[PDB]
Symmetry: C5
Subunit: 347 residues, 5 copies
Amino acid sequence: EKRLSAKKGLPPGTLVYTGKYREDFEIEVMNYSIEEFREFKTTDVESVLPFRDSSTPTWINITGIHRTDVVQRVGEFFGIHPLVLEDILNVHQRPKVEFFENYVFIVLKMFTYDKNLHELESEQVSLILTKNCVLMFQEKIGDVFDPVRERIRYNRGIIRKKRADYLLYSLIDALVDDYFVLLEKIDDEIDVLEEEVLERPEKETVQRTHQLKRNLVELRKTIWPLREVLSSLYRDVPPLIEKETVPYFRDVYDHTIQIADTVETFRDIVSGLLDVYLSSVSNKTNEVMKVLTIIATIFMPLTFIAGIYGMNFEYMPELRWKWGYPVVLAVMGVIAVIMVVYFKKKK
Amino acid sequence: SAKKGLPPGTLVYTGKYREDFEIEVMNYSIEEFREFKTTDVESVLPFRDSSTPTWINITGIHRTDVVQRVGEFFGIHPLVLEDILNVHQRPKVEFFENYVFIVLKMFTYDKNLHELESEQVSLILTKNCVLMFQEKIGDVFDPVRERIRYNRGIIRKKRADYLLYSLIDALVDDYFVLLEKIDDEIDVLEEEVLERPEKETVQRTHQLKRNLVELRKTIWPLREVLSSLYRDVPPLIEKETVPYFRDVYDHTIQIADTVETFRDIVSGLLDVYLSSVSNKTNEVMKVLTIIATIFMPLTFIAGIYGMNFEYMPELRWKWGYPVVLAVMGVIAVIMVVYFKKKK
Amino acid sequence: RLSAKKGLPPGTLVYTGKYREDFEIEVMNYSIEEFREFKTTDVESVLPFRDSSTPTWINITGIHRTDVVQRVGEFFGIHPLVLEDILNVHQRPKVEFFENYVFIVLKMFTYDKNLHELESEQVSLILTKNCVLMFQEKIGDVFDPVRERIRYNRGIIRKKRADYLLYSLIDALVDDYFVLLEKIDDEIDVLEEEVLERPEKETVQRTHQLKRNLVELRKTIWPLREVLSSLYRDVPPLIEKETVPYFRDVYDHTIQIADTVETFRDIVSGLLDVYLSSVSNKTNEVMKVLTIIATIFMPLTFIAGIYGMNFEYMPELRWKWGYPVVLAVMGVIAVIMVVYFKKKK
Amino acid sequence: EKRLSAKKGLPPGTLVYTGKYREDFEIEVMNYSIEEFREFKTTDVESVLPFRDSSTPTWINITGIHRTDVVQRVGEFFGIHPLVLEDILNVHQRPKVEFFENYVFIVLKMFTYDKNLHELESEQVSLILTKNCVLMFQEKIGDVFDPVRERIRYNRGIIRKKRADYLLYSLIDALVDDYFVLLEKIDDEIDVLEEEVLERPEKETVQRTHQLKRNLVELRKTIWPLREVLSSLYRDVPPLIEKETVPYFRDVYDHTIQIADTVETFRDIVSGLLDVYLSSVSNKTNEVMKVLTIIATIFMPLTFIAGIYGMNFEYMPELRWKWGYPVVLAVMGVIAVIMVVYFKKKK
Amino acid sequence: EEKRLSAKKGLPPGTLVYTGKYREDFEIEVMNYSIEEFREFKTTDVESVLPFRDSSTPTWINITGIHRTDVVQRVGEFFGIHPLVLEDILNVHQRPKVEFFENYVFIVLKMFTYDKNLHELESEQVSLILTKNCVLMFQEKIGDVFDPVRERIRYNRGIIRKKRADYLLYSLIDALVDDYFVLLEKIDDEIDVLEEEVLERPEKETVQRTHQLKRNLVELRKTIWPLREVLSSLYRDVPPLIEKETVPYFRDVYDHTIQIADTVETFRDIVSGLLDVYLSSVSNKTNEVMKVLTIIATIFMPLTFIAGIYGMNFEYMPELRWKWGYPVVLAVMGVIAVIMVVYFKKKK
Ligand SMILES: CCCCCCCCCCCCO[C@@H]1O[C@H](CO)[C@@H](O[C@H]2O[C@H](CO)[C@@H](O)[C@H](O)[C@H]2O)[C@H](O)[C@H]1O
Ligand SMILES: CCCCCCCCCCCCO[C@@H]1O[C@H](CO)[C@@H](O[C@H]2O[C@H](CO)[C@@H](O)[C@H](O)[C@H]2O)[C@H](O)[C@H]1O
Ligand SMILES: [Cl-]
Ligand SMILES: [Cl-]
Ligand SMILES: [Cl-]
Ligand SMILES: [Cl-]
Ligand SMILES: [Cl-]
Ligand SMILES: [Cl-]
Ligand SMILES: [Cl-]
Ligand SMILES: [Cl-]
Ligand SMILES: [Mg+2]
Ligand SMILES: [Mg+2]
Ligand SMILES: [Mg+2]
Ligand SMILES: [Mg+2]
Ligand SMILES: [Mg+2]
Ligand SMILES: [Mg+2]
Ligand SMILES: [Mg+2]
Ligand SMILES: [Mg+2]
Ligand SMILES: [Mg+2]
Ligand SMILES: [Mg+2]
Ligand SMILES: [Mg+2]
């Protein structure tokens, strides 16, 4: 209803941004050949539009898809189907490839993990590969893509030698790689949490356990498709040159499996955290209940006799007598002493 | 859940909705549009033979004679019409030579008392018509009606199969709304489960589980109905409508992701609460334990010196018990010190 | 009684089930123009119907008479493995295919409410030429409505052939399951009500019985779904454009049941964890009462037991305005132990 | 006595018996056809070597494969691969069916169950179908094949009319039949066990349920390859006479499924047995609390007032107007009785 | 508990970077052999092994200490190994695999070492490349399971000397897969000891060990599953692996691996209940602690109140004055104590 999960009743072609980031808008362009390169930014689309006809590889990054107007304008110019456009704009959706005639279309998820308050956020990056362009579409400023920029700029690696497909591999290889980062953060979280779980009895322990479990589920929900998307890229290939670029997506495929597995491992672990915790607590109850028993179980028989020697009659034998009070205190010290002897097994 | 012993062709509305019956009909082509309502079935019949798209919506299928009649007129096999009127059944598609047959489920989720309801929606695509069969009045189809009416979208331009698409599409899109609500209820529940120790909570928890089960049982085959429509297409215009069906599938893959997601999420809730309440039990134990461990030994010396004995001064010595009182105070001091490793 | 008949050759004919009670053969030969039906204990009398040109339903009941299964089978030309398959009632439902005939094993269920339990009886069907052969363990069945349909000519059955009678028999036999499931659905409803609102061990027990019975149900129903999958997708002596879509309809109910049998499994599966939580909570709130009485009364008996001391020259007895204030302070700490207790109780 | 799971360092054909039984060695032969049959035992492997070339089905039962010379001889004569000989000797393994050029190889297990102290042992059985011979290999004297022996002697059934592949069939069907016996015993154990769990709270119970869980896991591991074992015997069939022996293989294969389902039915039943125990313990903990609390909650407050009225004070007596003792005992009984009243709901 | 080696990022596709924890050893071994004779040697000079690319006879070249990525790059370029394959030899956090190429088979496998006492398992990654007449082996660290295979080559044991490079690769992976037998045995011992502990030893360190075992099992499954797939691909495809000879051998290894994997899922099946068996014991001791607490509580508290109503200072109240009251109250108190014990004769 409000800013989550619903644009409803709108026709099949409606361009609407569903995410939260309306802040920034910036349009980056990097063109390159083996010979030379150029880069620029701008806030005007009419400058970048002519690159669709380029003979040389081009990476056009639109940050600020919160502007539906520029997404549309570009979609139209490169001839992107309106359903596809709409997918780019609706950022709540699963990861996918859709191959078309003159183009490939890809929807990926970048993540961010804040430790301290433990939570994750996800930005949607959409890539379109057509002709010589990779069109990028982001929500906000910030991204994992920088090493690629450096690779182009400082001529490191093979990127300069290759055409646009290997560039889509470059952007996808970065995006996938940052998941390892997120995963390191998360195993750190796991270790911390199992320490806390066996050794540190509070309820905030439970709260954090649960938080990690959800963060893990959302992680997987985005992850398994992400694996299939790479899986598809590997087995089909309409404009992705074979004998050059194929083993490159394939290495991103092995990554997305190594990752898909790692979150599984994570899951099987975190599931039994809470069991370990129940085992910590009901074991802590056991030791308390043992203390209260020996405390109660010594003083309960004693307070009884001390109460039968405080009873008022007349006619009573042992009150006058006497020799009693030392013999009574004797029997008391004796019975509590055989209690403590009886407890040489327990605690 | 039982109509038994009846012949294969027997029309029995098996639903719980007995109240309303209505017939809505919209005939459109590119240049013009015409809509009407009625309770008279024959009046909507001549539309079987037209060369333009028409949406014929029969609400209140508890009236069987209408279903029989319309069926016989459009030439639909009695096994289908029975299927239409038996509303406990899974979403499927049957592909036929002169038509397609589709059963789907709309859901409804009441907050306050938290519960869900289902309507069964049937669709026949034949020649130039979409035949829609609803159990009761009101639907998620209002934006579609508004679209045909107001020439929004491409819908006016298009044909009967694309009308189908818009109908099913609207249906599927509503689940999004339902998911948002379930999400909210889940938020509330987990808040309460870690912070609010009550049995009404375990109930609400189990009910949410049960609901997620019913929802899953519907959602999963729904994924499959679109799976065919996208992949099969005998009288469905290819180059035009196949990509659009492909969308509704995408979404219905999504809805099924979110639902497993919820099941995974809720499935650990009862272990939270168990872990939470097993802790609060432990931390009230401590309180009862300290209260028992100081005040039990103390009440013990109070009982010695209340004993009535002919021997034993105190009696005399007349100091008190500053010293009884002081030994109490000192052993209490050390008990509490001992409990500086605890509460 | 029992689960092993062993050391025996593959052909050997043995009834493994528990009911030796009844024996009866019922025959209905019916055509478009007319119909006739009779019963008997005499086997040579039904044999000639092999060559009848019209639909016959031979329901042989009391398979515990092995010699009749032998007779009829050898006569109609049914293999020895199929005959033994008819006499062994411990087995999974299956469909096997052959030249002149189709072999079918199904299960009818009876669930007693009150004392909650289920028993099964096995029906074997053989469709051969114009005859459909039926085999039961004991008197009574789910098939009366198709009998009624044949006697009174209701619906399309009189027009059509023998494999349509297969269709109808099976359909009836599948439809039973719906009512079964309704019953089991009731059991589940009461059982969960009890589980959250009613902490006893008998409810542990019934939860277990329900889980078990549900297991049995899944185990019968799942191959049963695979049965009508095969009758729908294969079809050699089954008239296609006429019967095959009637076949698909049972195929569809067979599926609906299976999903429902799952829903019940998934729901039963949690019913223990809801019980554990109610008991724990119940265990908690039982503990809280113990403490609050202790923590207000235990320190109370202590300061109330100081002034029961027989020491002379307390002096503190000297306050003898005294006791009401001595009573007061008690209540005060008592109250402040209660005033410890009006948050979190 | 049962060499552990490893013989390593050894090259691939190394023929080593890894089991515990060295005790007996015997060889039994039955040559038969429609007309007649001859049967004999022996310790001499030379006299059973000629039967490889038999026109008519022979059954060679070698018992005592600890004698590895024998297995080597026989193996080399009938043309069996060193890897399969090795497989006949190493008894820690899964069942399999390997189809070769001139012969069929099966390994299968023959279980034995001890009730009382509950545990299961398994002898290996190896079967090689070659030409007209069934080669059969056993660790120890005693087996399940005695009634197939009897059908060969007393000419019961159709076995004499039929061939070597039918011999194979009979043997496998006796194996498979025995797992029913086994399952019956496990069902008995299961019933006693669940009954003891729900009505009988002791620890040797958990010990037993666990024993069973494990035993069923073992039985699963032996049976599931087996289901696939007779699956591949049913669906393939190069030298297995089709129109004769095939519907008989499918018969064993139906059995094999009932056995597995009977296993899976058991598993899902046992995995609930511990949760039954869990819920019985936690109701006992509750029911003990209940008893502690009604005693604590009626008497501790009644002790508080008896209590103030025993105090010896300067203004003592506070009351001493004789009314007025029994009024206190009255209000004692009244607050106790209304404690019971308040407990007339649950406890 | 800090930044772990996982991410090699910002780095190009071909980047050769060792991600392991072993920097210690470096050694290059060679055995070359034929039916007539063989030569074995070590060296740190890579250029001396290189000519073996062109040998007619099978040559196993073991390169221990892949941390030196110049050696790894050398042998790679010289053998025409594609940079991505090279990089995989170098990156050790990754699942076992086969990849087949025009001129070589790349394989990734894993050796596991378990230590008892403090219970923990380390792995080492092994790479193998079937290329022409060579198998290139790459190890992180000295020591390995391939000793008997060397021993066979040296002293002419088995058939290995007659067969070729493909059978040499069979021999290597067979010794590898065969290690997992030992490993599963050790994990079994720990399992028995640990379930005994779970029932009969109520300590928190027991819990620590149960969870530790569980984690070890998961890391062990994660590797062990595709290990199965690696041998399956190897059985069923076979481009330069001589078929009618070497395929059955590869099949055998596949078999043990199916066994290996089955076992691993059985251990998992057991350790998953191991913690519920603990929590059963614990609740049960406390259960039988609370009993003790409650039966001591319920006999004396009705007794301490009977002792309360007695003194208790009031007038009238015989009771006190008729004598006989004290002993008769020892009788009542006593008898009610004995009927509490009698009611508790359904308990202990
Ligand atoms: C030297 C003085 C001579 C006085 C007259 C002698 C008469 C002979 C009597 C036999 C002696 C036994 O006397 C015995 O004393 C003991 C305690 O002293 C009493 O026992 C008394 O105190 C014990 C405490 O241990 C209580 O458990 C018991 O309920 C109470 O009756 C016995 O009830 C009485 O039978
Ligand atoms: C002082 C003389 C030195 C020589 C030693 C002998 C001293 C006397 C020994 C006393 C033996 C104690 O054994 C016994 O104890 C109980 C207290 O539980 C006393 O008192 C008991 O009397 C009878 C038992 O029959 C009961 O009615 C009463 O309830 C009970 O208290 C008995 O009178 C005494 O016989
Ligand atoms: Cl690059
Ligand atoms: Cl009919
Ligand atoms: Cl119906
Ligand atoms: Cl049988
Ligand atoms: Cl071996
Ligand atoms: Cl036989
Ligand atoms: Cl890498
Ligand atoms: Cl060798
Ligand atoms: Mg849409
Ligand atoms: Mg790689
Ligand atoms: Mg019906
Ligand atoms: Mg879309
Ligand atoms: Mg006093
Ligand atoms: Mg049999
Ligand atoms: Mg059979
Ligand atoms: Mg139908
Ligand atoms: Mg070996
Ligand atoms: Mg082997
Ligand atoms: Mg890389």
